[PDB]
Subunit: 446 residues, 4 copies
C-alpha cells in the first residue's frame, strides 16, 4: 500500500532564479497530514496522526527552476468536456503572462492529437486577448479528443516549439500519458516539466475531496431532477428515470438525490442490485404514491446487458414490468431524461470559477518551481501536490456506511419501513396542527 516514498513529488534539478511575483515566499517544502485524526484520546502531549502519510502543500516558492522570460508554457485539454476547462486555460495563461512574464503560451488543439506532427500545425498562440472572456463559455477553445499519441512524436513537438512546461488537463488516462511524456523527456535529458490538472466531473480522484466542475455538475443534475419530477408527478403511476454521470462512482447521483429531495430510488455503481430489487422498490413506492423518480449512474447495472446504455435498458425494463402488471397499474407513463449534454457543457458556477483559477495559478507557481510528474489536488481545505503514479493507482468511491449515503437512504424507498404505521403518526401530527388553526380561527371572530 501507499508509503511516504509514493507521495514524494519530483523536482527538476536546480532553482537558480528568484521569483518575480510581488511581496504585497516559501523557502522549503511544507506538509499537511493525509489523515488529521488522532491515534489516542486527548492527552497532555500533542496528538499523533492515525496515518504515517504527509502530503506536500502547493505554494509560490521564493526560488524557481525555469528562467521566466525564456520559458514557454504549453496546454492540452483531453477527453469529455467538463465545466471550467476554459477557466483553467485562462488562469494558466494569465498567471504565466501577468505574474511570471513568460516568453510564450501555446494551446495544443483536440487533446494529444495537437502534439502529433500533423496536429501541431493547428497549435494556437494564447495571449491576454485570446482568453479575456473564454471562462463565460462551456467546452474548451483548444478542443479535446480521446486516446493517445506516440510519446516520441509529442516530445519532438515540445522540443521543436521550445516548450519548457506542459499542463495536461484530463482524466486518469491523460495523466498516465503525461508521466510517459515526462520520462521520454528525462530519457533525452530535455528540461521539461509535465504537470497535471485533474479533470473528472465525478470527483473520484483519490488524495482529493473536490475536483473542478463537480459542484456545477450537481447544480445542473438537480435542475434535471426538478424537470423529471414535474413530468412524473403529472402522470397517474408516472416514472421519471434520469441518468446522472457516474462512470465508476455515484458522487453526482448521491449529492443530487439529497440536494433535490425528489429521488425515490438512487442507483450507483458502488451498490449493484438486481432488476427484481429495483422493481420491488418501485412496487413499494406505488403502494402509497402515484409517481416515482429514479436516479441512475451510467456505471450502474453493467451486468444487466449481454458501456451498455443503462438509462435506456432501465426505462425499457420498468415499462415491461408495468405492462406485465397493467392489472394493478392500469395506466402508467415512463419518461427517460439524459441531461448529460447540459451537465458537462455549461460554464462553471462562481464557486467553481474561483476553484479553477486557484488550481491553475498554484499549478503554474509549482511547475515554475520545477514540480513535474504530479497533479494539483484539494484535500482538507488545502492545495497539495500528488505524484501521477500513486494518483492513477487508486480511485475514490461512495462509502455505503458514510453520512452522504445515509441521507440518500433516509429519502429513498426502504422495504424495511412500516409505511402504513409511519402514516398513522403523520396523520396525528397533521390533526394536531389543523386543530390549533381551527381554534385560532374560531377565536379571531369577535
Amino acid at each position: 500500500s501507499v508509503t511516504q516514498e509514493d507521495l514524494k513529488v519530483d523536482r527538476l534539478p536546480g532553482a537558480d532564479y528568484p521569483n518575480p511575483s510581488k511581496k504585497y515566499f516559501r523557502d522549503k517544502t511544507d506538509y499537511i497530514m493525509y489523515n488529521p485524526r488522532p491515534r489516542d484520546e486527548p492527552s497532555s502531549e500533542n496528538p499523533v496522526s492515525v496515518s504515517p502519510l504527509l502530503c506536500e502543500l502547493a505554494a509560490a516558492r521564493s526560488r524557481i527552476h525555469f528562467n521566466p522570460t525564456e520559458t514557454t508554457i504549453g496546454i492540452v485539454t483531453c477527453g469529455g468536456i467538463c465545466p471550467g476547462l476554459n477557466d483553467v486555460i485562462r488562469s494558466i495563461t494569465l498567471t504565466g503572462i501577468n505574474v511570471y512574464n513568460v516568453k510564450r503560451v501555446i494551446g495544443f488543439r483536440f487533446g494529444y492529437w495537437g502534439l502529433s506532427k500533423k496536429g501541431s500545425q493547428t497549435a494556437i498562440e494564447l495571449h491576454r486577448g485570446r482568453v479575456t472572456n473564454i471562462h463565460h463559455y462551456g467546452g474548451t477553445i483548444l478542443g479535446s479528443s480521446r486516446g493517445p499519441q506516440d510519446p516520441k512524436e509529442m516530445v519532438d513537438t515540445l522540443e521543436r516549439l521550445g516548450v519548457n512546461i506542459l499542463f495536461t488537463v484530463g482524466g486518469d488516462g491523460t495523466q498516465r500519458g503525461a508521466l510517459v511524456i515526462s520520462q521520454e523527456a528525462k530519457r533525452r535529458g530535455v528540461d521539461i516539466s509535465v504537470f497535471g490538472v485533474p479533470k473528472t466531473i465525478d470527483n473520484d480522484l483519490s488524495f482529493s475531496h473536490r475536483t473542478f466542475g463537480f459542484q456545477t455538475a450537481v447544480e445542473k443534475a438537480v435542475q434535471a431532477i426538478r424537470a423529471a419530477y414535474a413530468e412524473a408527478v403529472s402522470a397517474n403511476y408516472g416514472v421519471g428515470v434520469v441518468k446522472l454521470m457516474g462512470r465508476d462512482s455515484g458522487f453526482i447521483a448521491a449529492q443530487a438525490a439529497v440536494a433535490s429531495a425528489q429521488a425515490n430510488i438512487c442507483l450507483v455503481p458502488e451498490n449493484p442490485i438486481s432488476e427484481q430489487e429495483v422493481m420491488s422498490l418501485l412496487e413499494r413506492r406505488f403502494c402509497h404514491s402515484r409517481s416515482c423518480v429514479i436516479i441512475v449512474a451510467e456505471g450502474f447495472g453493467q451486468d444487466w446487458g449481454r458501456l451498455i446504455d443503462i438509462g435506456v435498458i432501465l426505462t425499457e425494463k420498468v415499462k415491461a414490468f408495468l405492462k406485465a402488471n397493467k392489472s394493478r397499474y392500469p395506466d402508467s407513463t415512463v419518461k427517460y431524461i439524459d441531461p448529460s449534454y447540459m451537465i458537462r457543457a455549461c460554464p462553471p458556477s462562481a464557486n467553481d470559477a474561483l476553484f479553477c483559477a486557484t488550481l491553475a495559478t498554484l499549478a503554474v507557481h509549482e511547475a515554475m518551481a520545477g514540480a513535474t510528474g504530479c497533479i494539483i489536488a484539494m484535500r482538507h481545505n488545502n492545495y497539495i501536490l500528488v505524484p501521477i503514479k500513486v494518483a492513477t493507482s487508486v480511485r475514490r468511491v461512495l462509502d455505503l456506511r458514510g453520512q452522504l449515503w445515509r441521507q440518500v437512504r433516509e429519502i429513498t424507498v426502504d422495504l424495511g419501513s412500516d409505511v402504513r404505521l409511519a402514516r398513522k403518526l403523520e396523520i396525528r401530527r397533521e390533526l394536531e396542527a389543523i386543530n390549533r388553526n381551527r381554534d385560532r380561527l374560531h377565536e379571531e371572530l369577535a
Copy 2:
C-alpha cells in the same frame, strides 16, 4: 383545391340563454358610454387599397369577438361551481392557468366552489371522479412556481355520457378544458351532451399547445418559455460540438406538425447551421450536402430538428414494448453513417444527440408567460360567467378573442417559408447557393483590413 369555408356565422360564439345577474366586478355605471355588449376586431387588419379619401377596407370579411368582463352575467355567482381539467403533454404555465381560474372564480366572482378533475378526462369518469380535489385559496397559493399540473394529465377520451353524469352529480356549471385539438373536440362533445339533457353547463377551452400552431392565434401560453429553454439546449449542444474536430450536435426541439420553436430558437441562438422543420421536407441526401458544405470551412455543425420532420425517413424493443419513430435518433444514425463512409475527408468525427424535451415542457413559465397565463385564465372566467360556451380564448394582433371550437379544430398554423422568420433562418443556416471558395476569400480580406487598422493604431501609440 380544398379551401376552408369559414363565414362570419362560423365565428359567432354560443351564449347560454339569459344574462339575468349584474357583474359584481364590472358595474355598467363605471363605463363612460352606453351598450355593454359584443365588440369586434378584424381577422386581417391589412387594407384592400392604397391610402385614399375613404377609410380602408379589410382584405378579409371576418370579424372576431373580443374577450372582456361583461356588465351582465348568465351564472348567479354564489350558486356557481367551476370545474377544471388538464389533458395531454404538460406545458409551462398549466399551474398558472389552474391558479388564475381558481382565484378569479373565488376572489372576483365569489363562486360557491372550484373542483380540479385529475389526470385529464379520466378524472370525470365514474371511477376517476373519486380522486377530484377541492381548489381553495390554500391549495393554489404557490403552484405557479412549479412545472407540470397539480391536477395531473392523461391522453385520450372518456364516455361523454359518464362525464356529464359526473358534472351533473357535482353540480358543475362551468368546465374549463385545458388541452390541445383532441381535448377541445371532446369539450364540444361534452357541451352537446349537456345541451341534449338541457343541463345549464358552459364548456370553455384554454388552448394548450407549446408549438403555437393554434389558428386564429399568434401566441399560446408556454411557447415563449419553450423558446428560452430551446436556446439553452442549443448553447450546450454548440459547446459540445465546437469542442470536437468535425463535431456535430443534433438537438430535437418539439415541433410535432410545425417548426415555430425550432425556427425562433435557431434565430435567437444564432448557433444553428441546419434547421429541419415539417413545413420544409428535404431528403437525407440534401441534409448530408448541407453538412458537407458546413465542413468545407468549419470544424463543427449544429443541427436543429423538429420531431415532425422527415416522417417519410426509414420505415418491438428487447422488453417487448412497441418502438415509436424518433427522427432525432434516425438523423443522428444517418449523420454517423455519412461521416463513417467519408472517414477519408472527416478523419475523426463526433456526433452527439440531445433531447431536451423534458426540460423544455416541464419548467415553470417565464414572467412574461406567467402574465399571459393569468390574463387568458381571468378573461376565460369573465366570458364563461357571461355564458360563453363551445369556444376557446386566443390572442391575435395584440388582443384577446373568443373562437368557436368547431372552427378552431378545423384548421392549424404552419411556418410560411416565404415569411421574415424563415428568411432569418436562411440567412444564418448553410446555403448551397453560395460560392464556398469565393465567399471565403472576401471573408479573409475583411478580417485582414480590420487587423491592419489595429496594427497601425498600436504602432502609433508607442513612439507617441
Copy 3:
C-alpha cells in the same frame, strides 16, 4: 389623438432606387396595415371598414434599393441609459450590412452623439464580423453611450468626412429628435445620407408601437427584484418592502411586474397620482390582517411630493408613519430596493434577442431602400415604419380602465372593501377547507 393625418405617417424616401437587391429567395411596392383594426359598423356580408383612416407602411426587404451596396458605409450610435439588447441591435445591423448587402464598411460612433463631434470622432471603431461575434451575450453597449446633444453641423461634418451613407440612431425620444435635425442638415447640403432610428425605451412608452426591445427582459428582472423584496418583508413582523421599478413617464414595467409576481400589495404609477395620505391608508388597510406589505413605485410617481428620488422619499415617509403609530405597529421594518442597475444592464431574454435581431435586420433592409427620418416599430404583430416627427409628438401611458390595470387592482389593497366583513368570509372559506381535511384524515385511521 383626435388629430394625426395620413400625411403625418408618410415615410420619406431618398430619391431613386437604381440598384437590384443582392439578397435572394421581395416587395416591388409599399404595403400597409390599419392603425386601428376595429370595424366602424356591426358585422355584415361586406368586408369591414376601419374606425380610423390611418394606414402604417409595413417594413420589408425591397426588390429595388437606393444605395449601391459595395459603395455604402453604415454608421451606428447608441445614446442615453443602457437597455437590454443594445449589443444585439449593434450586432444585427453590422451582420445584415456585411453578410446580406456586402456593404463597404460599418462604423461604431462611441459614447452617443459625442462620438460624431470633431473631438469624439477620433474614437470611432471599425465594426467587422470579428468585433461583434459574441457581444449580444453581454449587457451595456460596446460603443458606449452618453446623454445630451452635439452641434448638428459638426456631426454632418463627421458623416461627410467618413463617407457615411446610413446612420442608425439607437436611443429615446430626445435622440430621434436629434436624428431628424441631422437628416435635415444633410438634405440642406444635398448629402446622400439616410438617418434611421431604432427606438430604445425600456418603458415601452413609444406610440405607434405595442413593444420596444428590452422591455420584456426588464419585466423578468423586475419580478426577480419583487421576489427578493417579498422574502425580506414576509420575514419581519410589520415588514415593508419598497421597490422602485423604472417608469419615468409611464408604469408598464411596474404594472406587468405587479401582475406577473402576484406579490405587490400597492402599485404606484405616474398615470395614477395619489397623495402620501392615500398611500399610508393603503398600508394601514394591508396591516389590518397581514404582517407584511410590498410597495412597487415607478420613478415618475409622486413628482408633486417634493416642495426627486421618490424611492428614498417614499421609504422615509413610510418609516415616519410607522414610527408615529408605534402604538399599533410595535416593531416594524422598512427596506428600500433599487434594482435599476440589474434591470437595465443584463443581456436580453431569448425572446428579446429574436426581437432585437428582427428590428435591426428590417431597419437595414428599409434604409438600403432609401427610408430616412423614420423609426422601425412593432404594432399588431407587424413591423412598421413611422416618421420621427409624429413618433416624438405623442407618448404611450397605462389605460386605468384597461384589463392590465384591472388585474393590478384585483391583487392590490382596496379601500372600497369592508375590512371586517371581507375577513369573516375569508375565515369561513378556510374553515370549510380544513374541516374537509380533518374528516378525510380521521377516516384514514382504520
Copy 4:
C-alpha cells in the same frame, strides 16, 4: 503583543447527564471521536507518525448509539433570529424532518420572529411544524418562522419552553443569538429543567472561527458576482465610468474578496482588514483611468469606519451603527472627478447596493446539501444530549464547538494568504511603471496580431 488563549477545556462540549435510550435510527458511534484543530506536522517526514503543531482536538459530530432524550416524549423547538440568509428554510425543514422521520419525536414547534416568539406575548403565534408544513419551504428565501433582532427576558423565554414542554431549542442566528442561547441554557440549569440549547450558526460573511464554511456564504458569492457583472456593464458603457458596489462584509471581506476573484472584473477591492485612506483610493482610481475608461470598486460595509464619525448608537442586535460607506465613497469619488474635470471631462459614478438580492434568495444546490447536513447532525447530537454548543464545518468534517469559545474569536482575511494575493493580481497596483508596463502590453499584442496576419495570409489559395 497579545495572543488568544484557547485550551482543550475551551473545546469540551457540555452533555446533559445520562444517555439511557437506544438510537432508533438503523443501517452508530459508542464514544466521542476527535479531529486535529491543525493537521500540519511539527517535524519533517520520519519513521514515526507525524505530530500536530497544535495540542487542540475538536469533537466530531455524528449519530450516537445511546441518546439522552426519550424520542417519543421529546419536543423540539426552532427559532430564526437576525438578518435573513440563504438556506434558513433548509435548516428549519431538515431539523423538522430529522426529528419526525429519524427519531419520531412527539412534536416540533416553530417560534416566530426570533426570540420575540418565545416571549409571553409572542408565544401565542408559535406554529406546529409537521411534514406537510415544511415540504417545499426550502425553494424560497427568508424564513417561514420570521426573524427579529435583539434579546428578550430569559425568564419569560424559559417560562414558554417549560409551558410547551420543549426539550431541545435550536437557535439559528449570529454571535448575538448564540450568546442569548447560552443565557437561556443557564436559566434552565438554574431551575433544574432538562433542556438542550443547540446553535446552527447563521453568518453570510463566513467569519465564524473553528470553521471554513457557514451556510448561505457560497450562494452570497454567486449573487455578488451577478451584481458585479451588472455594475461592469454600466461602468464600461460610460466614458470614465465608475461602478461602486457594496458587498456585505460587516467585520471581514470574504464575500468581497471571493466575488472580486470569481468575477475578475473588480479594479479596487476595499475590505475592513485593509483600511486605506480616501487619498490612496483616489490614487488607485487615477492609475486605473491612465489606460482604461472604466473602473469597478467593491466595498465591504465595514470598510472605512474611520472615514466619518457615526452616531455612537447600537442597532436592535447590539451592533455599532455603521456610517454608510457605500454612499460616502460614491460621494467622494464624484467630488474627486469633479475637482479633476480637466482630465476626466465627462464622468459617471453609479452606486449599487445588491444586499437585498444577496441575502433573500433560496440557496444554491451545494448550500441546500450543506444546510441539510448541518441540521441533521445538529438533531443527532442534541438528541445525544449536546448543549451550549454550535455545529461547524472544518477540514471537510463536521465538529461541535462550545458557544463560549465560538463567540470569543472571529475570522478575518489573511492579507498574506493566497485569496488576497489573487485579489492583488487583478486589482490596480501603484507599484507598476504605468509607461513601461504599457509598452510591454503593446509589444505582446503586436506579436499576436502579426501571427494572426500570417496564418490569414497563408489560408488564401
